[PDB]
Design a protein around this ligand. Structure first.
Ligand SMILES: [Zn+2]
Ligand SMILES: [Zn+2]
Ligand SMILES: [Zn+2]
Ligand SMILES: [Zn+2]
Ligand SMILES: [Zn+2]
Ligand SMILES: [Zn+2]
Lengths: 143, 143, 143, 143, 143, 143
């Protein structure tokens, strides 16, 4: 790991439903990993970066309205202009019975439930790199 | 404090702009504190709860597109059916120059910048309380 | 009251649901009061202003998809740079049975149902104040 | 006119921009007229109705982020199952200079600026009509 | 027809619901026809244009979450500054039973189901017309 | 290829901006490929399916507000419960100068510009497969 792990955390609201049955789409996780990756790039080189692509996105558990979700990312390798990052998505709380809209019961997921993993790469053109911006990234070094 | 502090963390995207000039509205913070409060209520008594009101919301710094934000909340007092909570909002990263849309430079806020505080109260009817759901809340006790 | 009361009015659509059960979050009301406050500031001094904070937000009735809502605000006191405003939220129509998604019946709320109240304050820096912009605000005077 | 005029009122936020240059699309007005029409149908016959179509939508002035807008509608004719309604859209306040994102100046539109008109028709199947729900509609009568 | 028919195609997600019962509003179709019209104007004269109005919008079948929809438009007449266009909306796939949120069954609409038609007009000021931009529009000629 | 290619087509509006500078996030493409994949699954086996993951997402050109985009997908292999699909994203029109918000000029991309590719897999549990629903998929066969 280069630098600290970045952790986003938020709730799936009714606005996050995508399919019928209060089911959130897997792309919602990818949206959040894009923002996690951006934060990592701000810290390592002071630019919001451009997202190049992914490998091995795996969606491992369904996500519903009322789930509380965490999205973890970290830099695995600092390249010359490209940065290889790893990502995870975890469910930390949920409604007890999504099928009953009037049921207000909810609980924690302890341990948390793995909902996705991915490897991604981000790019900052050499002329736009500004060096580390956040103290945990100070010994980021390039090849 | 009763139980653990809950920390939401996410990015302000262009979708979070509300006013002209890429300025986010203060209500965006209140939206997030509602979800923080919900998470606390899930953990303390197993219900999503109803939000009763606030006191002393203070908005202390402007928030823009490209800001990375954290939203902290915790339970201060467990009542019979009402729960008094404290909330904070903190900026952890930002664009360098929001006034130049083509400027991709961004940096950390170290130390983080205080953007808001509030006291709020949430309600779970007695019949809907289920006891603690998350281990850090196990010694929640009522009057 | 200084100037006229501003009244926003609109419908809660399915897009306004936040929690399960077609329940709208209280923060939706705060979002609308921010826009009511902005309109008041445009009229009193010709600037969109910055929202400083609230006191005594109280949420008094639940709001659902298909509710028609009014949001009232007015200036109580013109300060030097700060303006104290009062806000209310009222339900004027609703679905008869939110628990049956196929039920299309709806009715008025006559009398209207109080859903929230608040006191808030908004700020316009002295250099940005332009004087009244709307005829009902012409005798706005500062201390 | 049958019954009272319904008036929606709200702000165009940055979220309402559609085209480049902070320009709102004309369809945003049609969205709001759909909700105005729904409210009229709730009042005249107690059902949210189905929107059948329009004639003569005319868009008469551009709408931008930061405009405050009113949307008026009323019933012109109560049919057997169809209801002919008239609609208008009016601008009541606006930013002074949309082309300068840092300019916070705004003013009223006094008199208000006409932004659109339309004639539309809505439908409630005979079996779903429940009679008037709001006192101003009490003498709604059908052919 | 002047030039080619433009065809938009997409899915109604849960985010497109507007009324209760997973029902999409007719204005969603008008939103899409605005974007179809824009594309036609880009191709015929190189400007995003301004939408002037409609005649004869007819909404002919309800649209729900999980419907796959196509939106067709074409130029019927090139005027001096105004362009008369025709529009259609077609349903190509749908959920089998919208009333059961846990039912994941879906099917095609073969033949496709007509959901709307309209005639609209768009405007490009003479000074902003740039001539055809897309090869199928090369023989666009004005009066 | 098994069955026909599915083509989604739509516009990036101001609502699709994500980063500063009117830049759309790469996750917007992944959102659309999820809906393309869903449509393919409806046609091949009559269920909306669950998205399993991706390989080799590559983002190849930036996307901005005012771009018109096409999203292509097709089934490469029908498995027992998993379906391997290929996806592409293409830009077909764009604003001439995104950096000038008042510039309304736009043009076609002829030839269209490649913005992304991916391989993905979708899942329908055996008990939920219903056979082909759309005539071009009639000779879908499983191992
Ligand atoms: Zn570096
Ligand atoms: Zn308890
Ligand atoms: Zn003044
Ligand atoms: Zn009647
Ligand atoms: Zn021409
Ligand atoms: Zn099959």
């Amino acid at each position: 790991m280069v630098g600290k792990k970045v952790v986003h955390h938020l709730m799936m609201s009714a606005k996050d439903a995508h399919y019928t049955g209060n089911l959130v789409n897997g792309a919602r996780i990818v949206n959040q990993w894009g923002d996690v990756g951006t934060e990592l790039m701000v810290y390592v080189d002071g630019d919001i970066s451009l997202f190049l692509g992914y490998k091995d996105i795996e969606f491992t558990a369904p996500v519903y309205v009322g789930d509380f979700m965490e999205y973890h990312g970290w830099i695995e390798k600092v390249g010359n202009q490209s940065y290889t990052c790893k990502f995870e998505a975890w469910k930390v709380a949920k409604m007890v019975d999504i099928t009953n809209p009037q049921d207000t019961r909810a609980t924690a997921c302890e341990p948390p439930v793995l909902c996705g993993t991915a490897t991604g790469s981000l790019f900052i053109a050499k002329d736009n790199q500004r060096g580390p911006q956040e103290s945990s990234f100070k010994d980021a070094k390039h090849p």
